[PDB]
Amino acid sequence: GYDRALSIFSPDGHIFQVEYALEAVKRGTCAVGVKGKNCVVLGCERRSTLKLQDTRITPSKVSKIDSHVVLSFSGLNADSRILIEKARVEAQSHRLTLEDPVTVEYLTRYVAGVQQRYTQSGGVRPFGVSTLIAGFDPRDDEPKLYQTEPSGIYSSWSAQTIGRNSKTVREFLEKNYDRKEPPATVEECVKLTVRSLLEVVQTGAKNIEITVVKPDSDIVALSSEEINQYVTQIEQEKQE
């Protein structure tokens, strides 16, 4: 089999293939996650150079891993499908053997492990993908939001963003998100997520996708008009 060590150290102690995988993430469409007091919201940008697109069938950017956990990403789209499949298989395997669905942290730890493994295995390149993984542990109402990256490191975030211009929207969230006062409602949290995206997005058209995840496997995608209402309500408070 093809065995070449593609991920190796450079004289300055850097692994370039892992670092170049992050450059692929930087070029991907922006993703953001914000967790409220009793919910987590996942917002994604869609690049607007493509119309004549059929959005019924086009791969959506937020994927259910199980009924209670979701995953979105920035970077290579084809690479992300491999992680999503593996994560879905592991979620069913966990239910089968442990007789309990995965915790959000366990699932994150699994996906992160897969990514790390691809940074010191022969004949493979790292995933050009970072993920936000969100949901609620079974029988628990505390929201969860984790991030993973090509190197395989992962951590928990009150709110986080990845992809292009994520520095700008991280700036926004860093001064607009209070740890003491998490967005106390669905409406409140969805709004803060939509605002953060509007810093970077362009038109608030079908350029913003939003997904809300509530406790006990209650997950729903917002449609254009429902998001449009948030967009409308936000500029009307801006001119002031």
Binding site: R4, E23, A24, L52, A78, D79, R81, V124, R125
Partner: protein, 244 residues
């Protein structure tokens, strides 16, 4: 030893791009244009053959349009031999699904598997990618009529109308202009041929330089029929739409 001669087909550039995928896409941009257009009552696939000769046997030739099963067909842009490898794999996948579930394979599931195969060649194994882009035209009872494309990166997307191969920028602009959601198949046929007629690098567009196909519900009572056009039938449709 052997490391010396390894091009490393599966590495990132410093910008985070996959060289071989980019160069395969460059190869594909010189292939004959293929167009897919979706209507409410069917789908059209139209494609331009590569610079002919008068001695090429047209009526027995197939370079662009392939049947994957009774409900799904593909238009090819790129290396034909690479495409045949993937096509036969897709045909087998479709039968595996039918054998397992006793239901025809949903269009997206077939498209995802082929795209996952393409993706694998960009991440592991040290082999060059397939120099092929596909347009998938098919029908199933979940989403009805569907159009997808896939390229050497293994990314796929859905479309109302799409082109691959040469002059896609020009072709996409023309389809973007004249396409409408309520459009019917017989209009979509006309649109596809008109778009190829304008984007072609040939002097004019003729029957011997085209492959053509439709997927219609146009079959007695709730069921779908594929029609790969004979050369005489392409000649008729060219006249009928006033291009010759």
């Amino acid at each position: 030893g052997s490391r010396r001669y390894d091009s490393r087909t599966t590495i990132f550039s410093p910008e985070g791009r996959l060289y071989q995928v980019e160069y395969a896409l460059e190869s594909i941009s010189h292939a004959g244009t293929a167009i897919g257009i979706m209507a409410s009552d069917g789908i059209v696939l139209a494609a331009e053959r590569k610079v002919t000769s008068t001695l090429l046997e047209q009526d027995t030739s197939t370079e662009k349009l392939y049947k994957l099963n009774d409900k799904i067909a593909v238009a090819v842009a790129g290396l034909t031999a690479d495409a045949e490898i993937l096509i036969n794999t897709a045909r087998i996948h479709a039968q595996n699904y039918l054998k397992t579930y006793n239901e025809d394979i949903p269009v997206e599931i077939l498209v995802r598997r082929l795209s996952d195969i393409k993706q694998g060649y960009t991440q592991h194994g040290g082999l060059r990618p397939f120099g092929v882009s596909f347009i998938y035209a098919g029908y199933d009872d979940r989403y009805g009529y569907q159009l997808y494309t896939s390229n050497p990166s293994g990314n796929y997307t859905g479309w109302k109308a799409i082109s691959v191969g040469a002059n896609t920028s020009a072709a996409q602009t023309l389809l973007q202009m004249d396409y409408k959601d309520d459009m019917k198949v017989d209009d979509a046929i006309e649109l596809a041929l008109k778009t190829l007629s304008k984007t072609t690098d040939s002097s004019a567009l003729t029957y011997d330089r085209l492959e053509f196909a439709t997927i219609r519900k146009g079959a007695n009572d709730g069921e779908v029929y594929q029609k790969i056009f004979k050369p005489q039938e392409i000649k008729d449709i060219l006249v009928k739409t006033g291009i010759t």
